[PDB]
RNA sequence: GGGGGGAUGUCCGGGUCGCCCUGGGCACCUCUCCGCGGCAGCGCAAGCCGUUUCAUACGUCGCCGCAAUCGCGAGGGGCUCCAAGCGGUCGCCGGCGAGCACCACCCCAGCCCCGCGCCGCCCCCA
């Protein structure tokens, strides 16, 4: 749920009362932007702008931006039940028990698959792929798709029919995401350890000791810094392989061969110089 | 009491297929101190204990028919060739010893070649093709050979023992592929598929914590079943990855054997818990079974 | 299972004693909520059930010194007493030294563990 900027130096965090943007390079908060409760999601607008998209627990669609405070006045209430889940693409689609877009069990979450679109819906044990273990969280990578599902236990099933068990966590997982170029599976957990799943040669290497806080991790727009949401009301932009927080938020021819052309048969009884010239030019 | 070798009669009607186990007393038991056993088909089974004798076993007589022996020392591995027959049997002294299975007789035929280092004890073999051999070593090396000429192809040397203590990677199990690559199940828990055209490694899958003692492939080259000095077996699927690992067993797993015929594609494992335990190949299909 | 009650099938006090009943004890079996939690619609309704996986990184190591503090204890004396000594922890705006490499290749030995055969000794018949 925290989200970067298109030019990487701005972090974006929603709280239970407002929306706060941050400087990834230098300092703490930049804009206190008003967002009342008289919260489901906040992503960026996809095609032309980078404004925002916030959905509250019932239908009030905030289309609001940073670089201003504009957008504190215009919700939308086209849907009738309390909103559960929310995803934007380019074109908005909202999970209410079913979808409304522009089924047996209870819904959990819903995520969107890029430009040649696909939809991934998430109940407890069901998961709905749409072309045109008990779940906790999941991420995805396209190019033709790969889905990494976490779980209420420490099993991280991977799908590309058969899953793969990536079980480490001695409680629920709270965060599973694909890393960058898809080499690593960066996962988190309840037990403060941010595990780097190797997913190549099947090793594991991690960042163990932290502020008892790991849930809701996000990956940089490049292969760089991961930002961590943190259950002690903290976010943490960690650059990669530092694992140190950048942001805390609370014609060469030897002459002797031509001499060897002219050593034998001294002047007379030498071959005729058409032939001797063919020897010389054939040496060159 | 413990298992040390499992082998199926065939691996592909009322055709008599049987299962041959070797029990660590010295016993042999067949379902519908010995150390190794194979079959031969074109069907009779051959076994070794720790001594240098490689012996046939007649089944309807249930007596050790046609013992064979030799000069060198303790046989630690042997195996039979495929078709476009002999036996190849590697020992402690670094010899690999060819035995002849000319039509009915088990002869001490020939010792082709031997490593220069006497401290290279061979552990297992597998046949990459008809006439060329893959052998693990007690050092980090696994090594290919040709039996047309006896020659010594490329040493496929593993690393050091990083995880602590020892230096040498003792390669406990080696198997092959229908693709043409070869899996080496080494010590220190790891497995690694080595390429087959160039004889170099291509993937080093670390799954187990302690040394993989045995592994076996599917007959279609699809599922790889490892089993280690932990209580742990693990499966592998496509270059590769693992899927899961369940402690089916109770001691270390010491011997695998796979079969893919008669609508019953099972793989049977045994170790030192004295309990042979059978698995399907369709590991997401249903449960398993065990027999004692 | 709270109370459920079928002379069910049980003995010990009680009646000369027939089936038996009368106080104490429990094994079997069907209900309202729960003793307790698990499944299906909207802050809350209506109906069901029972007494195998998995654990927490790198970043640099060695020796010595100071300051607070703490422990053991040869050796000697009746759980206590003294003491030669020796270590640990926290601070060192203590200092010194070196960083693959305590590794690769090979050879000679040695500790340990394992094999096989001689002796050294003790045996029993003789």
XYZ file of C-alpha atoms (C1' of nucleotides) in Angstrom:
702
model
C 0.000 0.000 0.000
C 2.801 2.647 0.373
C 3.806 3.872 -3.054
C 6.785 5.639 -4.647
C 6.797 8.440 -7.220
C 7.598 8.214 -10.931
C 10.708 10.234 -10.175
C 11.840 8.002 -7.323
C 12.510 10.610 -4.612
C 8.985 10.775 -3.097
C 7.417 8.192 -0.782
C 3.643 8.071 -0.228
C 1.960 6.771 2.940
C -1.703 6.597 3.964
C -2.619 6.723 7.644
C -5.959 6.161 9.370
C -6.648 9.913 9.128
C -4.821 11.403 6.111
C -2.324 11.044 3.258
C 1.309 12.045 3.813
C 4.068 12.302 1.203
C 7.753 12.164 2.047
C 11.194 13.010 0.691
C 13.152 9.817 -0.043
C 16.358 11.837 -0.281
C 16.393 14.291 2.618
C 13.671 14.693 5.203
C 10.263 13.851 6.693
C 6.765 14.829 5.558
C 6.072 17.268 2.753
C 2.276 17.550 2.593
C -0.469 17.034 5.127
C -3.343 16.568 2.679
C -6.861 16.512 4.106
C -8.821 13.272 3.827
C -11.749 12.956 6.264
C -13.804 10.013 7.536
C -17.288 11.532 7.801
C -9.780 3.628 4.010
C -9.518 0.915 1.355
C -6.780 1.909 -1.075
C -4.568 4.526 -2.694
C -2.664 3.913 -5.919
C -1.345 6.168 -8.656
C -3.183 7.117 -11.798
C -1.775 5.062 -14.624
C -1.903 6.500 -18.120
C -1.357 10.250 -18.299
C -1.082 11.713 -14.727
C 0.299 10.586 -11.390
C -2.385 12.125 -9.224
C -3.730 9.468 -6.738
C -6.736 7.159 -6.246
C -8.087 6.687 -2.707
C -11.101 4.567 -1.769
C -12.713 4.668 1.679
C -14.587 1.797 3.322
C -17.816 2.863 1.631
C -18.076 4.451 -1.776
C -16.177 7.774 -1.764
C -13.643 7.800 -4.607
C -10.979 10.432 -3.914
C -9.118 11.574 -7.033
C -6.470 13.663 -5.327
C -2.842 14.576 -5.940
C 0.368 15.760 -4.396
C 2.271 18.788 -5.832
C -0.936 20.520 -4.541
C -3.743 19.836 -2.105
C -6.272 19.601 -4.927
C -8.907 16.881 -4.705
C -10.304 17.334 -1.205
C -13.862 17.886 -2.468
C -14.864 15.254 -5.072
C -15.853 11.731 -3.959
C -18.097 9.296 -5.859
C -20.758 6.884 -4.578
C -21.877 4.849 -7.606
C -21.807 1.598 -5.586
C -24.174 0.562 -2.810
C -22.376 -1.788 -0.385
C -19.344 -0.825 1.705
C -16.277 -1.051 -0.540
C -13.960 -3.953 0.199
C -11.188 -3.864 -2.413
C -9.886 -1.561 -5.081
C -7.595 -1.636 -8.125
C -6.719 0.830 -10.905
C -5.421 0.136 -14.417
C -5.159 1.631 -17.927
C -9.802 2.300 -15.920
C -10.963 1.440 -12.434
C -12.322 -1.742 -10.896
C -13.719 -2.304 -7.417
C -14.468 -5.467 -5.447
C -17.715 -5.184 -3.473
C -19.789 -10.029 -2.713
C -18.631 -9.545 -6.300
C -16.908 -7.225 -8.743
C -17.964 -4.063 -10.440
C -15.572 -3.379 -13.275
C -14.626 -0.396 -15.451
C -18.568 -16.693 -6.663
C -18.847 -18.883 -3.582
C -16.635 -17.863 -0.662
C -15.780 -14.671 1.216
C -13.632 -12.123 -0.662
C -10.158 -11.212 0.575
C -8.416 -9.048 -2.039
C -8.126 -8.237 -5.733
C -5.168 -7.263 -7.924
C -4.741 -6.120 -11.512
C -2.422 -7.411 -14.245
C -0.799 -4.939 -16.646
C -1.587 -3.538 -20.053
C -2.824 -6.580 -21.900
C -5.008 -6.866 -18.908
C -5.845 -9.730 -16.604
C -7.618 -9.855 -13.252
C -6.619 -11.840 -10.154
C -9.366 -12.240 -7.555
C -8.759 -13.603 -4.087
C -11.102 -15.470 -1.753
C -9.804 -17.752 1.034
C -8.759 -20.800 -0.996
C -10.170 -19.714 -4.352
C -8.328 -17.447 -6.764
C -9.881 -16.258 -10.011
C -7.739 -15.684 -13.106
C -9.478 -13.610 -15.747
C -8.359 -13.083 -19.329
C -9.946 -10.762 -21.896
C -3.560 -22.886 2.238
C -5.649 -20.015 3.609
C -4.484 -16.866 1.826
C -3.052 -13.810 3.566
C -1.379 -11.787 0.796
C 0.015 -12.346 -2.686
C 2.041 -10.652 -5.402
C 2.518 -11.193 -9.101
C 4.774 -10.621 -12.087
C 3.812 -10.595 -15.775
C 5.615 -11.893 -18.904
C 2.688 -15.260 -19.313
C 2.201 -14.673 -15.588
C 3.554 -15.825 -12.221
C 1.691 -15.590 -8.915
C 3.252 -15.879 -5.453
C 0.667 -16.560 -2.747
C 1.551 -16.305 0.939
C -0.591 -17.871 3.632
C -1.960 -17.959 7.164
C 0.910 -20.351 7.846
C 4.514 -19.825 6.737
C 4.027 -21.459 3.327
C 4.572 -19.332 0.239
C 3.146 -21.182 -2.750
C 4.490 -20.138 -6.146
C 2.478 -20.669 -9.351
C 3.445 -20.326 -13.008
C -0.595 -27.823 -12.332
C 1.417 -27.466 -9.139
C 2.499 -24.853 -6.552
C 5.861 -24.594 -4.822
C 6.126 -24.529 -1.020
C 8.437 -21.809 0.253
C 7.847 -22.321 3.970
C 9.968 -20.389 6.435
C 7.780 -18.369 8.749
C 6.909 -19.419 12.311
C 3.588 -17.499 11.984
C 1.527 -15.895 9.156
C 3.472 -14.153 6.418
C 1.914 -10.629 6.156
C 3.932 -9.813 2.961
C 5.137 -11.684 -0.149
C 6.475 -9.773 -3.155
C 8.456 -10.464 -6.307
C 11.756 -8.609 -6.514
C 12.551 -6.418 -9.484
C 13.808 -8.606 -12.322
C 12.062 -11.612 -10.761
C 15.200 -13.292 -9.423
C 14.357 -13.004 -5.715
C 11.148 -13.378 -3.752
C 11.326 -10.766 -1.002
C 8.982 -11.821 1.786
C 8.240 -10.620 5.263
C 6.645 -12.053 8.381
C 5.264 -11.470 11.836
C 8.602 -12.313 13.470
C 10.477 -9.102 12.401
C 12.696 -10.912 9.833
C 12.658 -9.679 6.233
C 13.518 -12.820 4.290
C 15.146 -12.696 0.864
C 14.135 -15.869 -0.940
C 16.842 -16.709 -3.441
C 14.455 -18.590 -5.823
C 17.482 -19.432 -7.995
C 19.863 -21.877 -6.336
C 17.454 -22.369 -3.526
C 19.046 -20.430 -0.686
C 17.680 -17.845 1.767
C 19.341 -14.686 3.076
C 17.645 -12.060 5.156
C 17.537 -8.975 7.372
C 16.658 -10.456 10.772
C 16.486 -7.872 13.551
C 14.149 -4.948 13.255
C 11.381 -3.150 15.132
C 8.976 -6.155 15.508
C 7.032 -4.640 12.689
C 7.078 -6.334 9.262
C 3.892 -6.138 7.214
C 3.042 -4.486 3.873
C 6.386 -4.272 2.075
C 6.835 -2.570 -1.328
C 9.555 -2.622 -4.004
C 11.192 0.366 -5.739
C 10.193 1.272 -9.324
C 13.698 0.248 -10.369
C 15.535 -2.734 -8.940
C 16.731 -0.471 -6.100
C 15.467 0.298 -2.562
C 12.626 -1.616 -0.986
C 10.352 0.407 1.274
C 8.936 -1.384 4.287
C 5.730 -0.643 6.040
C 6.227 -1.253 9.738
C 3.651 -2.123 12.439
C 5.243 0.287 14.952
C 3.816 3.097 12.761
C 6.999 3.400 10.705
C 8.099 3.136 7.086
C 11.644 2.429 6.044
C 13.245 2.980 2.639
C 16.142 0.500 2.572
C 18.551 0.674 -0.320
C 19.660 -2.647 -1.698
C 22.808 -4.458 -0.414
C 23.176 -1.719 2.135
C 20.247 -3.131 4.157
C 20.674 0.282 5.968
C 17.610 2.552 6.147
C 17.715 5.535 3.847
C 14.376 6.709 5.244
C 12.790 6.169 8.635
C 9.244 7.493 9.019
C 7.523 7.402 12.390
C 53.606 -5.844 -43.987
C 56.197 -7.033 -41.468
C 58.649 -9.404 -43.142
C 62.003 -10.329 -41.631
C 64.821 -9.513 -44.099
C 66.375 -12.954 -43.877
C 63.563 -14.587 -45.819
C 64.246 -12.296 -48.775
C 67.933 -12.980 -48.264
C 66.872 -16.629 -48.480
C 65.182 -15.716 -51.753
C 68.562 -14.449 -52.973
C 71.031 -16.897 -51.388
C 71.204 -19.839 -53.765
C 72.034 -19.670 -57.505
C 74.086 -16.484 -57.286
C 73.492 -14.238 -60.299
C 73.624 -16.580 -63.238
C 71.672 -19.872 -62.980
C 69.117 -18.039 -60.794
C 65.473 -18.469 -61.871
C 64.214 -15.714 -64.173
C 62.987 -12.624 -62.412
C 59.370 -13.171 -63.303
C 59.668 -16.211 -61.046
C 61.890 -14.398 -58.540
C 59.387 -11.538 -58.459
C 56.612 -14.071 -57.854
C 58.697 -15.283 -54.921
C 59.078 -11.713 -53.635
C 55.499 -10.517 -54.116
C 54.319 -13.877 -52.812
C 56.380 -13.111 -49.713
C 54.582 -9.751 -49.584
C 17.506 -54.314 9.996
C 18.194 -51.255 7.848
C 17.740 -50.752 4.111
C 20.878 -50.343 2.014
C 19.687 -50.958 -1.568
C 16.392 -51.028 -3.459
C 15.966 -52.042 -7.088
C 13.033 -52.745 -9.391
C 13.206 -55.559 -11.940
C 12.097 -53.418 -14.884
C 11.277 -49.737 -15.026
C 8.916 -49.631 -18.038
C 0.526 -58.866 -19.699
C 1.564 -60.838 -16.558
C 5.205 -59.806 -17.017
C 7.030 -60.791 -13.833
C 8.291 -57.580 -12.288
C 9.636 -57.884 -8.744
C 11.204 -55.644 -6.104
C 14.589 -56.460 -4.572
C 15.598 -55.048 -1.193
C 18.837 -55.447 0.707
C 18.551 -55.570 4.481
C 21.577 -54.541 6.554
C 21.833 -57.951 8.243
C 22.913 -59.355 4.903
C 19.374 -60.249 3.873
C 17.550 -59.780 0.558
C 13.759 -59.545 0.297
C 11.489 -59.392 -2.740
C 8.025 -57.827 -2.989
C 5.360 -57.909 -5.678
C 25.792 -56.949 5.380
C 24.583 -56.213 1.851
C 25.380 -52.844 0.337
C 24.294 -52.863 -3.305
C 22.221 -54.805 -5.820
C 21.047 -54.442 -9.437
C 18.977 -56.460 -11.894
C 19.713 -57.343 -15.496
C 16.993 -57.830 -18.092
C 17.827 -58.139 -21.825
C 16.545 -61.050 -15.369
C 18.929 -61.748 -12.499
C 20.156 -59.748 -9.526
C 23.713 -59.044 -8.402
C 24.744 -57.873 -4.958
C 27.791 -56.724 -3.043
C 28.442 -56.504 0.624
C 31.468 -54.648 1.894
C 33.854 -57.339 0.643
C 35.268 -57.501 -2.904
C 32.937 -60.314 -3.990
C 30.174 -59.491 -6.456
C 27.671 -62.309 -6.389
C 24.680 -63.359 -8.415
C 21.520 -64.605 -6.711
C 19.316 -67.367 -8.110
C 15.759 -66.771 -6.922
C 13.909 -70.068 -7.392
C 16.772 -71.809 -5.571
C 17.146 -68.914 -3.069
C 20.895 -69.521 -2.809
C 23.960 -67.467 -3.745
C 24.622 -68.758 -7.262
C 27.844 -67.735 -9.075
C 30.087 -65.698 -6.823
C 32.710 -63.445 -8.393
C 35.729 -61.759 -6.854
C 39.016 -60.093 -7.633
C 42.316 -58.625 -6.503
C 41.769 -54.948 -5.665
C 39.577 -54.265 -2.629
C 36.154 -53.278 -1.330
C 33.498 -52.776 -3.996
C 31.530 -49.650 -3.157
C 29.483 -49.394 -6.373
C 28.425 -51.249 -9.516
C 25.959 -50.924 -12.387
C 24.917 -52.484 -15.723
C 25.099 -50.848 -19.172
C 22.186 -49.895 -21.407
C 21.843 -50.781 -25.098
C 22.554 -48.729 -28.257
C 26.240 -55.892 -21.598
C 28.829 -55.696 -18.801
C 29.114 -54.445 -15.235
C 31.158 -51.535 -13.914
C 32.190 -51.667 -10.253
C 34.166 -48.925 -8.508
C 36.155 -49.578 -5.357
C 38.052 -47.951 -2.486
C 41.477 -48.099 -4.172
C 40.328 -45.957 -7.106
C 39.899 -48.872 -9.460
C 36.822 -49.268 -11.584
C 36.458 -52.919 -12.486
C 34.569 -54.307 -15.468
C 32.839 -57.653 -15.012
C 31.638 -59.712 -17.956
C 28.054 -60.930 -18.182
C 28.690 -62.996 -21.289
C 25.654 -65.048 -21.736
C 25.376 -66.673 -18.316
C 28.745 -66.319 -16.592
C 29.879 -63.626 -14.136
C 33.613 -63.192 -14.762
C 36.289 -60.890 -13.403
C 36.958 -59.401 -16.818
C 39.123 -56.310 -16.712
C 40.259 -53.292 -14.719
C 40.274 -50.455 -17.262
C 41.765 -47.464 -15.442
C 42.336 -46.043 -11.996
C 42.817 -42.626 -10.462
C 46.388 -41.536 -9.676
C 45.426 -40.507 -6.152
C 44.819 -43.514 -3.923
C 42.775 -41.232 -1.628
C 39.981 -41.076 -4.245
C 37.412 -43.630 -3.123
C 34.516 -44.004 -5.503
C 31.028 -43.980 -4.034
C 28.432 -44.350 -6.781
C 28.017 -44.538 -10.541
C 25.408 -43.756 -13.153
C 25.603 -44.163 -16.904
C 25.249 -40.979 -18.960
C 25.061 -43.103 -22.118
C 25.836 -46.611 -23.365
C 29.627 -46.615 -23.361
C 30.568 -43.745 -21.006
C 30.363 -43.621 -17.197
C 29.769 -41.013 -14.446
C 31.341 -41.828 -11.059
C 31.278 -39.871 -7.808
C 34.421 -39.562 -5.713
C 35.308 -39.276 -2.036
C 36.944 -35.962 -2.857
C 34.897 -33.165 -4.414
C 35.364 -34.633 -7.899
C 32.853 -36.583 -9.908
C 34.375 -37.923 -13.086
C 33.393 -39.282 -16.487
C 35.014 -42.185 -18.337
C 34.760 -44.066 -21.612
C 34.741 -47.861 -21.597
C 35.300 -48.182 -25.341
C 38.825 -46.994 -24.544
C 38.771 -46.850 -20.746
C 39.754 -43.193 -20.952
C 39.233 -40.499 -18.344
C 36.965 -37.654 -19.424
C 36.500 -34.350 -17.636
C 36.770 -34.099 -13.874
C 33.604 -32.363 -12.722
C 34.965 -30.949 -9.506
C 32.717 -29.583 -6.767
C 33.809 -26.978 -4.269
C 34.944 -27.055 -0.679
C 32.797 -27.833 2.359
C 31.819 -24.305 3.337
C 29.305 -25.016 6.100
C 31.953 -26.051 8.627
C 34.507 -28.608 9.675
C 35.630 -30.788 6.795
C 37.080 -29.764 3.434
C 35.955 -32.550 1.117
C 32.569 -32.792 -0.554
C 31.809 -36.524 -0.484
C 29.443 -37.223 -3.376
C 27.071 -39.872 -2.082
C 24.733 -40.354 -5.053
C 24.930 -39.721 -8.803
C 22.085 -40.164 -11.299
C 21.414 -39.298 -14.928
C 18.738 -37.878 -17.235
C 17.022 -38.818 -20.481
C 17.739 -35.203 -21.459
C 21.448 -35.949 -21.274
C 22.411 -34.121 -18.092
C 23.433 -35.728 -14.794
C 22.345 -34.938 -11.258
C 25.029 -35.165 -8.609
C 23.741 -35.461 -5.079
C 26.794 -34.509 -3.113
C 27.465 -34.059 0.580
C 26.575 -30.886 2.567
C 22.924 -31.198 1.550
C 23.186 -29.798 -1.935
C 22.219 -31.256 -5.258
C 23.549 -29.959 -8.551
C 22.596 -30.746 -12.117
C 25.684 -30.839 -14.348
C 25.326 -30.357 -18.112
C 26.002 -33.298 -20.355
C 27.498 -32.069 -23.610
C 30.263 -30.038 -21.965
C 30.356 -31.769 -18.526
C 30.052 -28.616 -16.419
C 27.491 -27.605 -13.886
C 24.388 -25.688 -14.757
C 22.458 -25.466 -11.493
C 23.284 -25.955 -7.802
C 20.031 -26.442 -5.874
C 20.569 -26.171 -2.125
C 17.702 -27.841 -0.329
C 18.856 -30.246 2.391
C 20.857 -29.441 5.497
C 22.742 -32.751 5.695
C 24.139 -34.959 2.972
C 21.845 -36.351 0.276
C 22.513 -40.072 0.371
C 20.260 -41.152 -2.477
C 18.145 -39.786 -5.297
C 16.340 -41.053 -8.367
C 14.737 -39.569 -11.459
C 11.470 -40.221 -13.243
C 11.533 -42.392 -16.347
C 10.373 -39.428 -18.462
C 12.886 -36.960 -17.001
C 10.355 -34.895 -15.086
C 10.559 -35.397 -11.297
C 13.717 -35.737 -9.214
C 13.423 -37.397 -5.819
C 16.232 -36.649 -3.359
C 16.699 -38.165 0.083
C 19.223 -37.096 2.667
C 21.060 -37.758 5.909
C 18.340 -35.651 7.484
C 14.896 -37.199 7.894
C 14.065 -35.561 4.606
C 13.158 -36.336 1.008
C 12.451 -33.611 -1.511
C 11.043 -33.412 -5.019
C 12.237 -31.343 -7.961
C 10.570 -30.143 -11.160
C 11.592 -27.928 -14.125
C 16.640 -25.212 -15.151
C 15.004 -26.728 -12.099
C 13.530 -26.119 -8.664
C 12.148 -28.012 -5.709
C 8.478 -28.235 -4.881
C 8.308 -29.411 -1.279
C 9.956 -31.608 1.321
C 8.150 -33.827 3.819
C 9.799 -36.056 6.416
C 8.217 -39.288 5.261
C 11.088 -41.218 6.840
C 12.453 -41.387 10.372
C 16.188 -42.004 10.038
C 18.300 -40.916 7.066
C 17.029 -42.094 3.684
C 19.525 -44.492 2.148
C 18.078 -45.898 -1.094
C 15.526 -44.860 -3.732
C 14.030 -46.846 -6.614
C 11.489 -45.684 -9.182
C 9.026 -47.514 -11.425
C 6.679 -46.167 -14.102
C 4.692 -49.109 -15.472
C 1.421 -51.072 -15.253
C -0.534 -47.923 -14.386
C 1.365 -47.874 -11.071
C 4.132 -45.254 -11.178
C 5.601 -45.472 -7.679
C 8.943 -44.659 -6.098
C 10.038 -46.690 -3.073
C 12.488 -45.393 -0.469
C 14.200 -47.113 2.419
C 16.695 -46.043 5.022
C 17.663 -46.993 8.565
C 14.276 -46.796 10.306
C 13.810 -50.448 9.152
C 10.594 -49.326 7.387
C 10.383 -49.314 3.582
C 8.029 -46.565 2.439
C 6.366 -46.178 -0.963
C 5.379 -42.915 -2.672
C 3.517 -42.161 -5.899
C 5.046 -40.121 -8.638
C 1.954 -37.896 -8.811
C 2.907 -36.257 -5.521
C -0.098 -33.906 -5.572
C -2.335 -36.871 -6.317
C -2.953 -38.715 -3.040
C -1.199 -40.006 0.080
C 1.636 -42.525 0.539
C 2.032 -45.991 2.066
C 4.592 -47.872 4.149
C 5.361 -51.555 4.579
C 7.058 -53.623 7.285
C -22.346 -34.205 30.646
C -25.661 -29.770 34.899
C -31.266 -32.072 36.118
C -31.857 -35.857 32.507
C -34.765 -41.573 33.760
C -35.735 -46.942 31.882
C -38.022 -52.156 38.248
C -32.453 -50.947 32.340
C -27.934 -54.044 35.885
C -25.043 -53.494 39.916
C -23.540 -54.871 45.454
C -23.511 -53.383 50.582
C -26.866 -51.854 55.605
C -32.856 -53.452 56.169
C -37.640 -57.311 55.990
C -38.817 -64.979 58.207
C -37.975 -63.998 52.774
C -41.157 -64.147 47.052
C -40.864 -61.752 42.252
C -39.375 -57.684 45.190
C -39.022 -52.796 47.541
C -36.163 -49.401 50.833
C -30.978 -45.621 51.808
C -25.512 -45.258 49.628
C -22.239 -46.313 44.802
C -21.780 -46.356 39.587
C -21.599 -48.892 33.461
C -25.717 -48.159 28.734
C -28.981 -44.783 26.388
C -32.592 -39.893 23.929
C -33.411 -33.526 25.466
C -33.371 -26.631 26.946
C -28.789 -23.345 27.218
C -23.577 -24.246 27.794
C -18.760 -27.135 30.235
C -16.088 -25.297 25.417
C -15.067 -23.908 20.653
C -15.912 -24.890 14.943
C -19.847 -24.073 9.811
C -23.905 -21.335 6.191
C -27.071 -14.141 5.998
C -27.204 -9.161 7.263
C -23.819 -3.308 15.411
C -26.984 -8.553 15.037
C -30.415 -13.130 13.503
C -32.025 -18.947 12.077
C -29.993 -24.488 11.640
C -25.430 -28.332 12.021
C -20.517 -30.978 15.048
C -17.349 -33.130 18.815
C -15.252 -35.017 26.007
C 2.222 -33.488 8.030
C 5.459 -28.125 7.117
C 7.813 -24.859 10.324
C 13.148 -20.806 14.628
C 15.980 -15.194 13.182
C 22.277 -12.168 8.304
C 26.386 -9.476 6.777
C 29.675 -6.007 8.290
C 37.479 -8.085 11.348
C 40.211 -10.715 13.872
C 44.635 -11.565 17.373
C 47.469 -10.008 21.747
C 48.247 -6.809 25.765
C 46.710 -2.395 29.465
C 43.311 0.660 32.747
C 38.822 1.474 35.560
C 34.156 -0.313 38.159
C 32.357 -5.172 39.251
C 31.905 -10.427 39.889
C 33.199 -15.587 40.191
C 36.146 -20.251 41.001
C 40.121 -22.352 44.124
C 44.684 -25.669 44.084
C 47.186 -25.592 48.800
C 46.405 -25.661 53.870
C 42.672 -25.352 58.799
C 37.637 -26.662 61.882
C 28.903 -26.059 55.487
C 32.785 -22.039 57.238
C 38.471 -19.375 57.195
C 42.971 -17.615 54.709
C 45.663 -17.275 50.353
C 49.180 -18.159 45.980
C 46.830 -17.427 41.712
C 43.341 -17.377 37.312
C 39.226 -15.896 34.486
C 34.210 -13.453 33.002
C 30.941 -8.788 32.368
C 30.091 -3.017 31.190
C 32.741 1.421 30.005
C 37.135 2.119 27.582
C 36.831 9.923 22.733
C 42.855 2.545 25.881
C 46.814 1.848 22.596
C 49.455 -2.082 19.245
C 49.451 -5.581 15.100
C 47.521 -8.033 10.759
C 43.859 -8.674 7.075
C 42.733 -13.949 0.055
C 45.832 -17.271 3.473
C 43.494 -21.062 10.015
C 43.683 -21.305 1.911
C 45.345 -24.042 -2.815
C 49.155 -28.267 -4.772
C 52.398 -32.050 -2.748
C 55.537 -34.901 0.806
C 57.146 -36.573 5.697
C 55.602 -37.811 10.498
C 52.351 -37.434 15.155
C 47.072 -37.366 18.340
C 42.586 -39.977 17.954
C 39.134 -43.851 15.795
C 38.711 -48.170 12.796
C 40.904 -53.302 10.222
C 44.019 -57.716 10.531
C 48.319 -60.966 12.840
C 52.202 -61.866 15.677
C 54.142 -61.979 20.257
C 54.094 -60.782 26.069
C 50.848 -62.926 30.033
C 46.914 -65.912 32.222
C 44.094 -70.546 30.870
C 41.956 -75.613 30.768
C 42.588 -80.567 29.433
C 47.397 -83.223 28.866
